[PDB]
Structure 1
């Protein structure tokens, strides 16, 4: 798909509360930080003898991930996330569709 880099949408930023321009980016999962409680518990459970202690997924079926757009308001720098439907190809740069062109 193709999605514009700018988007006029509602901004609930305690100052805007109205439609406003947003810079559009794709949400990145971020680094899974050490010292999270779940990671600490997992490390404690994995330490020692006994082997693997929690399930490891293997039966992957989806060939697509849900693309989530993060919108940064140009007014108050407030961020809002919205997900889209599954799409194999995603694009932020906008090459506009040409209707009456050949080839």
Structure 2
């Protein structure tokens, strides 16, 4: 799928409440913080005798992910998230069909 790097769409910002130019970016999952409560609880439970104490997921089936667009408002830097359908080939701002 081809998505233009810039689109004019409604901006839900407090100061905009209208259509504004948005830079489109693919949402990437950030690093996993070791200080998160789930990580802290997991570490304490995993420490000590008893083996592995939480399910480990081996049965991966889907080969594609839903792509999420993060829209940077040019005016007020407001960011909005849009999710599209699953696509094997994804690209941002490519050449137009001719």
Per the shorter chain, which TM-score range? over 0.9
Counterpart-to-counterpart distance in 1, 2:47 and 2:95: 52
Counterpart-to-counterpart distance in 2, 1:53 and 1:59: 18
Query: Is it true that 1:56 corresponds to 2:66 in the alignment?
Result: no
Ranges in structure 1 where 5+ consecutive residues have no aligned partner: 99-103
Q: RMSD of the alignment, in Å? A: 0.6
Tell me by how many angstroms 1:93 deviates: 2.5
Aligned to 1:7: 7
Aligned to 1:101: none
Q: Please list, as runs of the form range in 1=range in 2, the aligned pairs for 1:17-96 lying within 5 A after superposition.
A: 17-96=17-96
Ranges in structure 2 where 5+ consecutive residues have no aligned partner: none
* Higher share in strand: 2
Runs of 4+ in 1 over 4 A off after TM superposition: none
Query: TM-score, normalized by length of structure 2?
Result: 0.97
Residues 23-44 of structure 1, C-alpha deviation per residue, up to 9 Å, x if partnerless?
0110010001110000000001
